[model samples]
Target: ETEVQWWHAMGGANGERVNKIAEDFNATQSEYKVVPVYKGNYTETMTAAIAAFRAKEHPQIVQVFEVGTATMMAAKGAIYPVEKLMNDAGEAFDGDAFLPAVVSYYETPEGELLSMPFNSSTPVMWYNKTALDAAGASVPTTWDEVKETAQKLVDNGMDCGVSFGWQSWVMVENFSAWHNIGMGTKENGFAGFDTEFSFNNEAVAARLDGIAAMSEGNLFKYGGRRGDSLPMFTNGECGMWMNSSAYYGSIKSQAEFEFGQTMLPLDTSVADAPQNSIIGGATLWVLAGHDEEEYKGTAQFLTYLSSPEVQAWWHQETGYVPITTAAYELSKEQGFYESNPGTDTAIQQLSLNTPTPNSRGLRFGNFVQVRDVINEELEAVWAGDKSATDALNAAAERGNTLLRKFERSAK
Candidate 1:
């Protein structure tokens, strides 16, 4: 059997854990050898993969983040179905074993599972307990409280009141989902590539307007994409933040100050206040064109990697939520949540009942590029260069064009 190449982007603080998982899988079977390789960050790894594809040298399995789903899905004949691969390899791929929310994001419109999850994540609200207490406020669980608390913290001189990575991701995309606002017609791109951006409605416009007001009042902080916001939050300069649950490991390691985690808030006045937030982070994808045996290896590996035992272990060791519901129950039975407080927020946020169409999960291609456009427009809003209404509409216009372009080519 040919050795299966597993290229990934997890490194530095997260590298050792990834290596250990691969080693465990390799030891579990002799039919196929899994070679784990660290290929740098998501964009770098993806760029390399695309370059390799042009040269006809892509790997059997490649790890792609959620934002790149549309791009990967568009590469039609270039990928093989993970479920098919698993079945061909004599392994059963059970969609029921995983969280409905997690699986639905990667599933085809017809309810087929696309890529198997490896390092899936969901968004959560991160706060500095010390700062919240100093400002005489409790942990906020609603958008109303976040606004009031942020004001208090800033008035008390917490230099940066709030910040988050992927500003458009947390602020707009997920914001629409959590509030049950339509991101675009046709279920945020799930409907089809002909989908239209529909965030110009009153619900989204109202939220954007409120934030624009805050920005004018010197409230919002525009953290560059995956940029300095985390440092600012950890260094005692920021009072509040919202980011990926995967940040838990780093926060646990580096924060000298007390911190807390909670679900990202929604306006109770809104139709879906406290609605579900979508998942972020990465997943393992199998590229097409690999020989039959290689496909079998890829599928078996993905199934092995997603079993309750493995996903549960990953959840406990890292701050990420288990992709499977069983993993959550197993962790509770083992007292994992009690032993590690603040780790349950992501699960609860995602498990807040069935995901509505608004929150089923975002699946736009060119999402990475579109997210960049949102950052630029939103930064201008933060700097008082434009109103949130104008910025959001402009973003909708610009982003919709890219979405159309992606849909055209992907189909």
Candidate 2:
């Protein structure tokens, strides 16, 4: 039997789910066996894969986060674009069948799919139902409403009104996409490699300034980078938390009180507001240098991974939105959405509007580093060390330098 190595970054229950999928696939046929290997977090896994590729010992498949899209795309011969692989392996595939918001992020400007989207997620507002009821507040639909509701929660005895994780992703990247505003030029770097950061606009600055002002009154709390602030909501210290919809699994297991999720609050000041929120979870990228037989097995595994049966199960088990429309329909048919209210919040928000160039997604080179720069600047704002406008302007300038460096190296 041929062995296909899948080096992934999933840990905890999600990691177990990845193993189960591979085991099930291996059971279905005897010709090929897929081995799932956990390779630490996203950055470590991506770094290890690139190092292995240079040594000519890369795995057949590697999971990479959405921010690393540009780096993977610029790798030239290091990747076997999923569309070509499917065709070359004679496997049935249709790019259009996948969710536009999800698939478009991994597609070329010419519409060629480059990677298999595995765990796509978008941000949503998760509120403590028990706290909201005690505070006599409803789920907030706009920024103004969020502040009002959060203030009510705090006034009623909660430590803070709101907190969130992945500030750069949820607050900056998706925030821009949700408002249909460009984070950078040239279609958020999809059009070319010379894109510059333009996210320091008036609207974004105003939002950051507002958030900072809220912090002064203890209405909003700054959670450490990533999902560190999850405890704030689960512990009932905060009334509402904004983060990835993928947090559904953890939240379901962790929260003691009744909780509900809704679409991200809109800024009514933006014209035609509440545009689609971009995805954040990682995708399965097939690496080059594997043999033909291995590629065939990898293709088969990808097909199985994307099948509605598997996708619906994955979506129901995790909080991630299904990458394909069929999986979503299947989940709905299975009463998944009916039984679990607000579980489809991510899907609804992603499909809220047909994605304009601004809302489709971002593809900035070296964005992994750019996100850190953004985090640092935003941290300063939260600390009252810098004004929102100055911090954003600094972040833009610093991020643009990294983009230029990436452009030079990619060339």
Candidate 3:
């Protein structure tokens, strides 16, 4: 049997799914075997793989988060594009079979799939039904309602009004996308690597100001940059929270209260809002320099991963949006949504509108670093050290310096 090694970043229950996929695939085939390895978080995994490549000891495949797409694409010799892998292996592949928003994010400007979309997620509003019922408040739909509802929760002495994680992700980046506004030039970098930051306009500033005001009033609490807010909501310290739909499993296990998810709060006052939101999570990229047999095995494994049944199973188990439309349709037919209300929130949010250029996704070079910068600046705004406009302007200015550096390096 041939060995195809895969390095990934999933842990806990999600890690088991990755292992089970490899196990089941190996048992079903005679010619090839897959070995899955957990390699810390996404950033650590990508960093380690780069070092491995430099040492000529990299594995056959690696999982990278969505934010790392631009960096992976720039690694010309380090990866073999999945589009070419499937075509060269003569696998029966259909690029259009994927969910429009999910697949579009990983495609190149020429509209070719760069990586296999796996475990994709988008943010949603999760509310404590018990708290909301006690307050006689409904789940919020628009930004105004979010404030009004949050005020009610706090006034009723709920432990918290609202709290969220991934502040830069859920607020700045996805906020612009969800409102059909640009986060950068050239269709938010889907058109080129030379894109610059362009989200410091009045629209973004207004939203940030609203959120900052809420934070000041104890209506919204600052959770750390990642999923630190998970515990706050799960412990019923907050009446409402917003974070990745991918949190379903952990939240399900941790939160003992009756809770439900809904679409992210929209700014209905915006001209083209309620626009579809973009995805998070990660994709699988086949690293170059592996043997042809190993490459062939990777292709076969990817094809298996893309199957509708497999995608549906992963969606149900992981709370991720299914990558393929057929998988979503099949899931619906099987009453997955019926049995699990609000579970389809992420998928529905991703497909809500005809995606515009802004809504498809962002792909700025050095985005992971840029996000850290934004997080720092936004933290200042939350700390009351800077106004929303001032903080975002500073963030955009600082982020542009990194963009310029990436531009020089990309050449």
Candidate 4:
């Protein structure tokens, strides 16, 4: 049997699902054996794959997070773009069949798909239903409503009204996209590596300052970077929490009180406001240096993974948005959304618009570092150490330096 190795970062229950998919694929044919290997978290898995590629010992497939798209794209010979791989292997694949917002994030300027989107997600607002009822507040649909709702929650004895995780991603990146505002030049770096940060504009600054002002009344609380603030919501300390919709499983299992999720609150101040939200999460990339036979097996496995039945099962089991329209339809046909209310909130928000250039998504070189810089500056705003305008200006200035360095290296 031809051995096809797949290095991934899915742990816990999701890891088990990965293993099950490989097992199911292997059972369908005897010519190849698909091996699923866990390699720590997303960064560790991506780093290991790159190092192994340098040594000519990389797996045939690796799961890389969305932020690593630029790094993977710049590694010219190290990748086997999925479009070419599927075509070469004579596999039936249609890029358009996938969700436009999700697929476009991994597509080249010419619209060639570079990776297979697996577990894509977008942010949404989660509110504790029990608390909202006690506070006599409805779920907020706009920023103005969010503040009013949050204030009521706080006044009714909730320790914190609203909190969120992944400040750079949820607050800055997705925030910019949702408001149809640009975060950087050159179409958020999708055009070229010579992009500059532009998220310091008036709207973004005003929003940050508004959030900062909420701190005075404990209507808004700053959670640490990433998903650290998850506890604040699950523990029922906060009435409303804005974070990734992919936290569906986690929140469902942890929160004892009834909870509800909805589309992100719109900033009605912006013209044509409430644009589509961008996705986060990882995709499976086919790596180079594997034999043609192994590539064939990898392509077959990918085809199996993308099938409607498989994708629907994966979506229902994990909180990930289905990458393909067929899977989403299948989920609806199966009444998955009906049984679990608000489960399709992410999909609805992503499909809200046709995704203008600014709202499609970002593709900055060295974005992982750029996000860190954003986190630092935003932290200052939350801490009252700097005004929103000053901190954003500093962040944009610092992030541009990284962009320039990346441009030089890419050349």
The global C-alpha lDDT for each of the candidates, from Candidate 1 onward, is: 0.79, 0.90, 0.87, 0.89
TM-score of 2: 0.95
Q: Tens digits of per-residue lDDT for model 1 on 372-400?
A: 78888878776777877888888889988
Order of models, best lDDT first: 2, 4, 3, 1
CA lDDT, candidate 3, residue 370? 89
- The C-alpha TM-scores of every prediction are 0.91, 0.95, 0.95, 0.93
- Ten-residue stretch with the least lDDT total in model 4: 267-276
Compute the lDDT for candidate 3. Answer: 0.87
Clash counts per candidate, in order, are 2, 0, 0, 0
Candidate 1: TM-score?
A: 0.91
Candidate closer to the true structure by lDDT (higher is better), 1 or 4? 4
Best prediction by lDDT? 2
RMSD of every candidate to native, in Å, equals 2.4, 1.6, 1.8, 2.0
Clashing pairs in 1: 78-288, 79-288
Tens-place lDDT digits, model 2, residues 42-67: 87889899999979889999999998
Q: For residues 158-263, what per-residue lDDT tens digits would candidate 4 score against the true structure?
A: 9989988888788788999998889899999998888999999888889899999999899999988777788899999999999988777778878999999999
Q: What ranking emerges by TM-score with the best candidate at the front?
A: 2, 3, 4, 1
